[PDB]
Ligand binder design. Structure first.
Ligand SMILES: *[C@@H]1O[C@H](CO)[C@@H](O)[C@H](O)[C@H]1NC(C)=O
Lengths: 50, 51, 50
């Protein structure tokens, strides 16, 4: 906002609160919130399987 | 995708580069170069053989 | 390009050429090419397959 840089290329939110104070351009990519998990081993309790 | 957000470039107000960079981004996007270089820098190991 | 008005709030792809000659807002519905195909023919009954 004080122009102490030039066009900033970096992971940077597109937020309303920032767009109000700084200017943005067309996104080069889109984010997302998604789960992260480890694939199951496959093992199951001795009661459920049979 | 629980949420939707976009990475865009920052600049102060009145910058002439906003539009010139938007058009550049669109052309490079149509070039698919972004796609392949994203693949490269997000490639890593790959899946092993597990069957 | 003429001036009937400023707005066309419709599905309108923000392409390189269209941003050459049209100023665009930021995207609200990101769109992509996918494929459409049938689920299993699944032609099995519980009546006589036994
Ligand atoms: C997988 O096995 C590890 C031990 O090798 C165990 O700690 C873990 O709970 C198991 N997880 C699943 C989903 O089977």
């Amino acid at each position: 906002i004080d122009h102490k840089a030039d066009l900033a290329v970096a992971p940077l939110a597109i937020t309303y609160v920032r767009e109000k104070v700084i200017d943005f351009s067309k996104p080069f990519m889109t984010l997302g919130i998604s789960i992260l998990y480890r694939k199951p081993n496959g093992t199951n309790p001795g009661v459920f399987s049979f | 995708l629980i949420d939707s957000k976009g990475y865009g470039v920052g600049t102060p107000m009145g910058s002439p580069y906003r539009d010139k960079i938007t058009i550049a981004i669109l052309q490079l996007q149509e070039e698919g170069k972004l796609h392949m270089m994203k693949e490269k820098w997000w490639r890593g190991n790959g899946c092993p053989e597990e069957e």
